[PDB]
Every structure is written in structure tokens, then in C-alpha cells.
Ligand binder design. Structure first.
Ligand SMILES: *[PH-](=O)([O-])[O-]
Length: 491
């Protein structure tokens, strides 16, 4: 096969969540990573994109991100579909949305627009702020704005960050539309989105229809949903299905698996699934006896959260090397378990077989864009899982030290930004074999939210990701490594 990694992930997803194929996960062909002619790698919407500079003077990443948001929205002829984590978009993120909507209206288009946020009077206020800023362009727009929480007890709400236009173009990734953390700051958060076009943008629209179908059903339950619309417009549960072609047009030759999760409180199980997993013998992940652990000890949760299995399968598909860039691998316990046991087992299995693993996380000095005190909380866990498969602790340490790079993130030679604040990173990135990668909103640390992302198999694109993000990251981050097989570092 030309696509061994997607083939493996797809086989796992059809066993885990067959009933959700099409809507919460979907494999498509014929996509394109949507870069410019001048800089074909700039489908990779990293921010701030100021490598080497502790003052972050020339934010080529941020500039491209905002321009691409505006460009995509400005090309809308039918629909604009946005999801994010509250607060609602502000600053130049909001400016980009308003500019794009005005541009589409001026080209003569009438648009349907949905903006959904997850949260713990705000929607009506955002709607009114937006309508005011649109001026006469607002007459051409049917707007739905909503904030939602799907489970209070399981801390579940939307965490996806998606911008889909006409079901044809999609931007998604880790970037929340928060000006103070990303933009108006001399210590900007480092993160990444991707831009694509093609059938996979349709997959995102079907995912958002899934969320809005739940949201509209629960729109009168104040504890769950706060909803606001323009004029006398109703809630639009199936805007994508109703407005865009079921199969989006092809734009390229890139194969993609879209995958998300429904968290807790939308759907309890995929009734079509006959998935029956081997539970790992925990470990020390559940800090307290009373916590219900959806990550490690809830088969039904897996079936409505295919993204967890997809990311573990992506790791399992690697033949040579795996790079992981995250805010964290571990969560704060309580209320979440500290780590995903199956994920750490999958990483251990790969290191035991000589596949190299790089993990870069956000500096614990951020703890907050960090949930650990020390990198030892990651290496100790990996070592302990390795011990189960290498015969003991000494052999585990040897395997780990021979095959691991573990570090905290920097983007320049300085240990912190020039303003004295630590670097914060927020990527949700996994790449394998310079071939296949995930960019999306799903953190690898335990989390029970609605999330979404893309797994792309394209060595060309993967090589661009290496040159533009992963290689510069390791250039500056390697100085903090506690383990680095390539330099014989083993602490
Ligand atoms: P996310 O926006 O919490 O990772």
C-alpha cells in the first residue's frame, strides 16, 4: 500500500467505532494541503513562527494564520462553520472573521454561519458584537452562536477548534482564538493548525453537524446550552448536510483520516460497535479510589471517542520514529487520571522494538500551560511500562535511554522569552516516519472533551512539517532534554 499508516488506523477505527464512520471519523481521498504558491509549506499554520528570536519580532506564523482565516472566510459562498473553546474569538482573531464575512458579503453572497464554543449572556453579547461590527454585511448573514457543556460531572464540553467554509476548506488544530495568549503578548503561546481543502473538509462539517444536532436538541436546557441567533433564525443542527454537497469536490491527491470524539454527555456508546479491548492492568494513573476513569477503564467511552484509539494506532503504526509535541502528556489528577495507560504502553512497545520516540512538552515553569512539575513524571511512567515488557527496571532504563528524546519546548537559544516568561506550547501534534501526522485539538493527556483533527499520510507534507516546525523545535528544545539517545543523555 501507498498508505500503510492510514490503513492500520482505519482498520482500528472500524473496529472501535463502526457506527460513527462518516460523522465522527472518516477516511477520504483527493484532498490538498492548502499552501501558497510562494511557500508551499504554509498550509502549516504554526504560530508565532518566530524561530531563533527571543523577542519574537517577525511573527511570520501569526501573520499567515490570520491572513488564511480571512482568506478562507472571504471565499465563502454558502457556509462558515466555527468551533472553539471559550472565550469566543477576540482581538485580531475576531477582526479576521469580521473581515472575511464582509468580503464574502461584498462579493454578493448570502451566508449561513455557526459559531460554537465549549465552556465550563455571553453568546447573545458575542452575536451582538459581531452584528454591530459587520454593519450592512450582517443583512446577508444568518447567524447561530452557542456555548455548551455536555457533562458537568465529567468536565466535558467542546474543545475542537475548526473553521470550515462551504464544506470545501478547513482549518483545524490547537489554536484557541485568545488574543492575550497568542497575539498581544511578548511571550506568545506556540501552537499549530493546518489548512486543507477537499473531501476531508466535508468530514469536519459532518462532525460539526453532530455537535450542533446535540446542541439544538438541548437549547432550552440552561445548564447545558446558551444559544443566540440573528433575527428570527432558528437553530441549524444540520447546516452542513443541508447546504453543502455530501461529497465535497476533490482538490488534490492527499489521503486523510478525519477523527474526533463525542466526549461525555452526547452519546454514551456506539451501539454498532463490538469492540472488546484488553484493558491494561492500570498502574498508578488513578490518584484517587473513587474516580471513574473514562480514558483507561470505560469501553463504551472509547466507542464514542474514536480519536483516542486513532492516536494510539498512529503511534503503533511507526516503523522508524515518532515525534510528539504537546502541552502535556499527563493530566492533573483529580479529576482526570494522570495518564493514558494504553498510549504509554504503545510508546513503550515501540521503544522496546528500537523505534525512536521524541516527546517535547511545555515547560513546567508554566504551571497553566503545564500539568507536571518535572519531566520525570513522563520518563518514570515510560520506564515503568517498559519494565513490563523488557523484564525489569534496569532493561527498561536501557531501552528508554537508547530510544527516547524527552525535553521541554524552546523556540530560541534563550531558556525563556526575552520578557522573562517561560515558553508555553499548546500543539496537539504527532508525526511518524516522516510520513503520517496528526494535527488537531485532541491532547494526548487524559481529557473527556469533544475534539477533532486530521491524520494525513503524505511524505511530502511530513517533510515540510519537519523542516518548518519539528526540526527548529528540536534545534532549540534539545538543550533541556533529560533523555536524548542521540547524544547519550540519560538522567
Ligand atoms: P485545550 O485548548 O484546553 O488544549
Amino acid at each position: 500500500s501507498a498508505t500503510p499508516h492510514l490503513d492500520a488506523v482505519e482498520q482500528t477505527l472500524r473496529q472501535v467505532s463502526p457506527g460513527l464512520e462518516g460523522d465522527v471519523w472518516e477516511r477520504t481521498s483527493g484532498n490538498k494541503l492548502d499552501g501558497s504558491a510562494a511557500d508551499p509549506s504554509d498550509w502549516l499554520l504554526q504560530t508565532p513562527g518566530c524561530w531563533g528570536d527571543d523577542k519574537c519580532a517577525d511573527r511570520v506564523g501569526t501573520k499567515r494564520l490570520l491572513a488564511k482565516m480571512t482568506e478562507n472566510i472571504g471565499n465563502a459562498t454558502r457556509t462558515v462553520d466555527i468551533s472553539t473553546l471559550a472565550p469566543f474569538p477576540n482581538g485580531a482573531f475576531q477582526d479576521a472573521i469580521v473581515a472575511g464575512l464582509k468580503e464574502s458579503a461584498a462579493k454578493g453572497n448570502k451566508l449561513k454561519v455557526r459559531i460554537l464554543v465549549g465552556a465550563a449572556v455571553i453568546p447573545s453579547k458575542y452575536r451582538d458584537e459581531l452584528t454591530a461590527k459587520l454593519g450592512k454585511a450582517a443583512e446577508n448573514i444568518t447567524l447561530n452562536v452557542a456555548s455548551m457543556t455536555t457533562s458537568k460531572t465529567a468536565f466535558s464540553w467542546n474543545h475542537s477548534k475548526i473553521l470550515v467554509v462551504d464544506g470545501q476548506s478547513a482549518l483545524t488544530g490547537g489554536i484557541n482564538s485568545w488574543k492575550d495568549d497568542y497575539l498581544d503578548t511578548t511571550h506568545p503561546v506556540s501552537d499549530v493548525d493546518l489548512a486543507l481543502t477537499g473531501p476531508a473538509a466535508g468530514s469536519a462539517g459532518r462532525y460539526l453537524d453532530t455537535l450542533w444536532t446535540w446542541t439544538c436538541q438541548n437549547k432550552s436546557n440552561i445548564a447545558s446550552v446558551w444559544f443566540a441567533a440573528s433575527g428570527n433564525a432558528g437553530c441549524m443542527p444540520t447546516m452542513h448536510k443541508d447546504t453543502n454537497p455530501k461529497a465535497s469536490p476533490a482538490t488534490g491527491n492527499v489521503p486523510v483520516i478525519a477523527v474526533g470524539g463525542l466526549g461525555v454527555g452526547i452519546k454514551d456508546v456506539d451501539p454498532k460497535s463490538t469492540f472488546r479491548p484488553d484493558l491494561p492492568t492500570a498502574s498508578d494513573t488513578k490518584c484517587v479510589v473513587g474516580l471513574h476513569d473514562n480514558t483507561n477503564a470505560d469501553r463504551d467511552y472509547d466507542t464514542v471517542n474514536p480519536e483516542e484509539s486513532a492516536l494510539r494506532a498512529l503511534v503503533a503504526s511507526a516503523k522508524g520514529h515518532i515525534e510528539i509535541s504537546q502541552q502535556d502528556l499527563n493530566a492533573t489528577c483529580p479529576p482526570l487520571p494522570r495518564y493514558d495507560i494504553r498510549l504509554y504502553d504503545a510508546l513503550a512497545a515501540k521503544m522496546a522494538a528500537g523505534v525512536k520516540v521524541r516527546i517535547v512538552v511545555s515547560d513546567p515553569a508554566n504551571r497553566g500551560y503545564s500539568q507536571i512539575k518535572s519531566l520525570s513524571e513522563i520518563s518514570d511512567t515510560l520506564r515503568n511500562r517498559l519494565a513490563n515488557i523488557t523484564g525489569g527496571q534496569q532493561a527498561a532504563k536501557t531501552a528508554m535511554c537508547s530510544n527516547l528524546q524527552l525535553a521541554t519546548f524552546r523556540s530560541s537559544p534563550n531558556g525563556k522569552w526575552a520578557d522573562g516568561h517561560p515558553y508555553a506550547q499548546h500543539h496537539k501534534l504527532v508525526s511518524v516516519d516522516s510520513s503520517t501526522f496528526y494535527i488537531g485539538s485532541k491532547n494526548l493527556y487524559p481529557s473527556w472533551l469533544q475534539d477533532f483533527g486530521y491524520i494525513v499520510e503524505s511524505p511530502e507534507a511530513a517533510k515540510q512539517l519537519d523542516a518548518k516546525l519539528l526540526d527548529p523545535q528540536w534545534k532549540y528544545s534539545q538543550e533541556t532534554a533529560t533523555v536524548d539517545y542521540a547524544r547519550g543523555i540519560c538522567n
